[PDB]
Design a protein around this motif. Structure first.
Motif, PDB file in Angstrom:
ATOM      1  N   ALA A 180       0.496   0.631  -8.251  1.00  0.00           N
ATOM      2  CA  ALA A 180      -0.808   0.109  -7.890  1.00  0.00           C
ATOM      3  C   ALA A 180      -1.276  -0.898  -8.927  1.00  0.00           C
ATOM      4  O   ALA A 180      -1.482  -2.065  -8.617  1.00  0.00           O
ATOM      5  CB  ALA A 180      -1.840   1.253  -7.815  1.00  0.00           C
ATOM      6  N   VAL A 181      -1.462  -0.412 -10.154  1.00  0.00           N
ATOM      7  CA  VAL A 181      -1.950  -1.217 -11.236  1.00  0.00           C
ATOM      8  C   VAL A 181      -1.037  -2.397 -11.537  1.00  0.00           C
ATOM      9  O   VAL A 181      -1.544  -3.500 -11.730  1.00  0.00           O
ATOM     10  CB  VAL A 181      -2.140  -0.292 -12.455  1.00  0.00           C
ATOM     11  N   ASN A 182       0.286  -2.183 -11.574  1.00  0.00           N
ATOM     12  CA  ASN A 182       1.193  -3.308 -11.865  1.00  0.00           C
ATOM     13  C   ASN A 182       1.003  -4.399 -10.815  1.00  0.00           C
ATOM     14  O   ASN A 182       1.004  -5.590 -11.136  1.00  0.00           O
ATOM     15  CB  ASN A 182       2.652  -2.856 -11.902  1.00  0.00           C
ATOM     16  N   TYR A 183       0.825  -3.977  -9.563  1.00  0.00           N
ATOM     17  CA  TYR A 183       0.604  -4.915  -8.470  1.00  0.00           C
ATOM     18  C   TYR A 183      -0.713  -5.674  -8.685  1.00  0.00           C
ATOM     19  O   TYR A 183      -0.776  -6.900  -8.550  1.00  0.00           O
ATOM     20  CB  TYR A 183       0.531  -4.139  -7.156  1.00  0.00           C
ATOM     21  N   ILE A 184      -1.775  -4.936  -9.023  1.00  0.00           N
ATOM     22  CA  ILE A 184      -3.080  -5.552  -9.225  1.00  0.00           C
ATOM     23  C   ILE A 184      -2.987  -6.609 -10.324  1.00  0.00           C
ATOM     24  O   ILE A 184      -3.412  -7.750 -10.115  1.00  0.00           O
ATOM     25  CB  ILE A 184      -4.119  -4.452  -9.526  1.00  0.00           C
ATOM     26  N   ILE A 185      -2.393  -6.250 -11.457  1.00  0.00           N
ATOM     27  CA  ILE A 185      -2.211  -7.212 -12.540  1.00  0.00           C
ATOM     28  C   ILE A 185      -1.235  -8.324 -12.132  1.00  0.00           C
ATOM     29  O   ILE A 185      -1.232  -9.402 -12.734  1.00  0.00           O
ATOM     30  CB  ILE A 185      -1.737  -6.520 -13.833  1.00  0.00           C
ATOM     31  N   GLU A 186      -0.406  -8.049 -11.122  1.00  0.00           N
ATOM     32  CA  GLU A 186       0.577  -9.024 -10.660  1.00  0.00           C
ATOM     33  C   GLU A 186      -0.130 -10.285 -10.212  1.00  0.00           C
ATOM     34  O   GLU A 186       0.292 -11.397 -10.547  1.00  0.00           O
ATOM     35  CB  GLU A 186       1.372  -8.460  -9.490  1.00  0.00           C
ATOM     36  N   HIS A 187      -1.214 -10.100  -9.464  1.00  0.00           N
ATOM     37  CA  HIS A 187      -1.999 -11.259  -8.972  1.00  0.00           C
ATOM     38  C   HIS A 187      -3.196 -11.516  -9.883  1.00  0.00           C
ATOM     39  O   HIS A 187      -3.791 -12.598  -9.822  1.00  0.00           O
ATOM     40  CB  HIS A 187      -2.517 -11.076  -7.524  1.00  0.00           C
ATOM     41  N   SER A 200       0.826  -1.208   0.000  1.00  0.00           N
ATOM     42  CA  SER A 200       0.000   0.000   0.000  1.00  0.00           C
ATOM     43  C   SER A 200       0.856   1.251   0.000  1.00  0.00           C
ATOM     44  O   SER A 200       0.568   2.198  -0.742  1.00  0.00           O
ATOM     45  CB  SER A 200      -0.902   0.007   1.231  1.00  0.00           C
ATOM     46  N   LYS A 201       1.915   1.251   0.810  1.00  0.00           N
ATOM     47  CA  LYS A 201       2.808   2.400   0.854  1.00  0.00           C
ATOM     48  C   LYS A 201       3.643   2.461  -0.425  1.00  0.00           C
ATOM     49  O   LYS A 201       3.928   3.552  -0.919  1.00  0.00           O
ATOM     50  CB  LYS A 201       3.691   2.370   2.110  1.00  0.00           C
ATOM     51  N   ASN A 202       3.997   1.286  -0.984  1.00  0.00           N
ATOM     52  CA  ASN A 202       4.750   1.255  -2.246  1.00  0.00           C
ATOM     53  C   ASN A 202       3.863   1.801  -3.372  1.00  0.00           C
ATOM     54  O   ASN A 202       4.307   2.578  -4.217  1.00  0.00           O
ATOM     55  CB  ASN A 202       5.177  -0.182  -2.572  1.00  0.00           C
TER      56      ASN A 202
END
Length: 81
Positions: free
Chosen positions: A72-79, A63-65
């Motif tokens: 945000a988006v890269n993380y969301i697509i990550e999973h 969240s802080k990253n």
């Protein structure tokens, strides 16, 4: 099946749903906090929506990253898949 671009379409909704930031306004270069007006609550609510809508649980570390769409988006697509 949502790709990172789709994460912004899907996030566009959540974002427009929590912060009310536009689907158009959620580009890959907008700071969540500064450009998408994402305060701690905004990201907390988004993280909640993300955890449920995308199955993406953003820990305090993520969240802080996650301060810009890229993280945000890269993380969301990550999973996402």
């Amino acid at each position: 099946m949502a790709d990172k671009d789709q994460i912004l379409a899907d996030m566009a909704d959540i974002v427009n749903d929590i912060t009310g930031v536009d689907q158009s306004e959620v580009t890959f270069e907008k700071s969540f906090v500064d450009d998408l007006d994402v305060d701690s609550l905004s990201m907390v609510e988004i993280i909640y929506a993300c955890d449920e809508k995308f199955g993406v649980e953003i820990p305090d570390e993520e969240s802080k990253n996650i301060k810009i769409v890229g993280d945000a988006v890269n993380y969301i697509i990550e999973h996402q898949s």
